Amino acid sequence: ETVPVKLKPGMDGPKVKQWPLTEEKIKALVEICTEMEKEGKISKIGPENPYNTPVFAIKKKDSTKWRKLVDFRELNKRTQDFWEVQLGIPHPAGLKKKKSVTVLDVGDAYFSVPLDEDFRKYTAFTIPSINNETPGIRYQYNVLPQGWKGSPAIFQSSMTKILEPFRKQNPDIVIYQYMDDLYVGSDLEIGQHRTKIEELRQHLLRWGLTGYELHPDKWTVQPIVLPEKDSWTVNDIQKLVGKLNWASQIYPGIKVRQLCKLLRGTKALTEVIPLTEEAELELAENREILKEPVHGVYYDPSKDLIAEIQKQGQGQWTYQIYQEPFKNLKTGKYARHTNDVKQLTEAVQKITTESIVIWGKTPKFKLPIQKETWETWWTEYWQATWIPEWEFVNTPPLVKLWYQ
Amino acid sequence: SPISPIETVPVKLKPGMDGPKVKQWPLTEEKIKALVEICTEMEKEGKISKIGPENPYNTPVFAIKKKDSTKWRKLVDFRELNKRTQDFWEVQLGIPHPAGLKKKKSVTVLDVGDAYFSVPLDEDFRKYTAFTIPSINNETPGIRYQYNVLPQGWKGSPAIFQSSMTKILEPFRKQNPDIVIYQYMDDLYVGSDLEIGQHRTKIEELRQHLLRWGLTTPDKKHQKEPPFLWMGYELHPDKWTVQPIVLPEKDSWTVNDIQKLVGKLNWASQIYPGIKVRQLCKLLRGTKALTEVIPLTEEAELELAENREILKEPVHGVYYDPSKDLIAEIQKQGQGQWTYQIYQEPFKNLKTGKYARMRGAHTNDVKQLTEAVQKITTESIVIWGKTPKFKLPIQKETWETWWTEYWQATWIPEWEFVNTPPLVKLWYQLEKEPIVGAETFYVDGAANRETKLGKAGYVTNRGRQKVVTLTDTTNQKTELQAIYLALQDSGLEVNIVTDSQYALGIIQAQPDQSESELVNQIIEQLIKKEKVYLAWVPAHKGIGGNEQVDKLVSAGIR
């Protein structure tokens, strides 16, 4: 007996366009839906269904098997009241504290549960043809679709049951469910951890359900880093007071006066200048200041999370997560046969998964790329069962350095 | 005509809305007559059914004559019903491109006759399609009718017909995997590799299967012969091309003549390599009236001419062999103009095309080249389902240098350099470090938001100093002007410190062309230099030479 889904009032189904797919991914998808149709998970549909969600074919992490990935970002937004303020899955602040967190796929739990007949249409998607030889193959789900945030919201009750024994027997293990995945944290020895996971997999196995090791607690800083040196130049000071200046506003109490007076008159850039010790007091206070958190910055659940990424060079990328510009909740660095897109994709997922662990919600990405490039390529490297939201930006010449 | 035995597509009105109820204008006797003649026939053939006055709905009906002829056509204004009908799925979201067609032994085109009228309409929706043939003026209540088939002009016909034709073909497609059927509107394009025998035969098993489902098609002798004049193309059995392009010789060109011109050209551009259209296009800028004659600029005169030559002689394209690769070649035509050719076998093009677009206000060839590669990549996936191998007029060394240092992620799929000038390069590089024994120019610029008056100048560490007044500027303009001065009064090597992230960002990107003349002069200056270093400092921070030009250019201004 299905639970009923109602769209967020005065708004209706997603009518999202479908990206051109390559022959290889189109065939991979046809085979899949052919089988899903048989299993009765989805059903072909008539023109009288105006909706659409894009569908892609990914390969996963170190996998030879094609996997289907439906982009329910739009459908998600239009149902936010259901899966959030009505059938929400509480996020445990304990998770981020665990020595080890393992990620398991659980999306297969949904095809055993039926979808509200009246909501089915909203899950329509298309398998495109090539050179428009023919009409795409239209489908709609009959069961909880993977990728749709309503799925784990509904399955919540069944999941709670599936896990009751395990949890009862390991009160110090944290299990969080974010969409298709299960996050299991423990402070156990790796071997005892790996063991409990396999033990947890068995429970899962008795209900049908059939890891990837994260180590949150060892997720540390990345303070703005000021250079230490012998023999300074007008330039280096200039760079220093500029970087230190920008470090302010976000960092509380950054002083630059001292460093500034050394730059008096109009001198050459190459010209070397002796650092007055008080200046060092500043570098000291600033360095010390920079090596700490922010103070005053807290996460507000009613606010979207934002992630900026900067291409530094040589396989290195920097990133910051905040809700209010300059009020950084977290910042770090992802370091790499990898190309710019492959690498950037890998950062997006890395950051996202941490966000899911820390705040139990994904950031909206500001990607330093061409909307078009990203769009054609991102799928060749996507491995996640979810997709974060993203806009495209032109990185600010300075921000990149101030963060290196 | 048969009316397909097939299943019906449930149709619904838009939520919170009711069927239409529009009043019928009264028509002349000659028209009421025609409609009565037309309608009885339709009713006879089952197309429409007579109903009573208990049906509250109504659409207006009308009857037109025959331009030249003496027949009457009945027009049903389905505007209000369409506005009340649910939205349907988008029919076809693209159309087959010839160059994506694979060569087939034999192909027969099959147009379904009376398409919409050969397919039924949801029993419970038929009611909203009610219309009335008014009585002779006011007396007598009209003659009410309603549809049993897909009406012409109605929102859902194209969608429901296609669906039906899809459902009607599925069966056949199973027992005929080797057969290609192109569904386009109410046409069917059939091609197989069997000998004429099993073909002229298989086509028959098709037409027949079509008929058990109420669908009639043309039989041989009536089936069209190659070359197919389809969609502006010419479909020969071994090649393809756009239909004959006729470039109108003229005395005076009006806005509307150039417009049509540009279009014939652009269409021609899909197989005729080297078609340029920027000069012809510039004229249209701001354009007076449709009938306003525009004097052909001499570059435009020169473009039109070069185009005429390209068009002199016919060019054709080949078809797609799925086993060979795809090779994409790009060339720089100049003024942000690119041209590409796509072939599988060296110089036997499947198709050509061009890229112009000005992505950004300041750009360079490296940025443009990769924008065209992406535009082409997409194009390929669309037509062939796979991306081509590229041959670009850019040195692998240039590419590396640029991609490596650029702030933005960039990625060209498989490529190979091909020496086909002009070759793509970088016209200048900014040093990473300050130039020893080079004049440090501390530039700056200010502008009064009220008077629009500006001031741009610089103070060097070598004693030099300058300030220039600008009349209708902005801060951005003054700050770029300041850098221009420094580049003018400085010689082969300089160090430049500004507090303009805006100017910085603009230059740091190695632009080689801009919509701004200023930016263009700067570029010209940057290319002249032997080495330039450009740094940024915050403003209103007591930074050395900085705080010095500020007072200089702030005087009067602010």
Ligand SMILES: N#Cc1cc(Cl)cc(Oc2cc(OCc3n[nH]c4ccccc34)ccc2Cl)c1
């Ligand atoms: N009108 C139309 C019209 C419009 C479209 Cl989009 C397609 C069509 O049928 C074909 C064309 C093909 O490509 C080239 C070709 N192979 N063999 C041929 C014989 C004669 C002419 C062209 C060809 C290959 C297969 C088919 Cl199904 C006919």
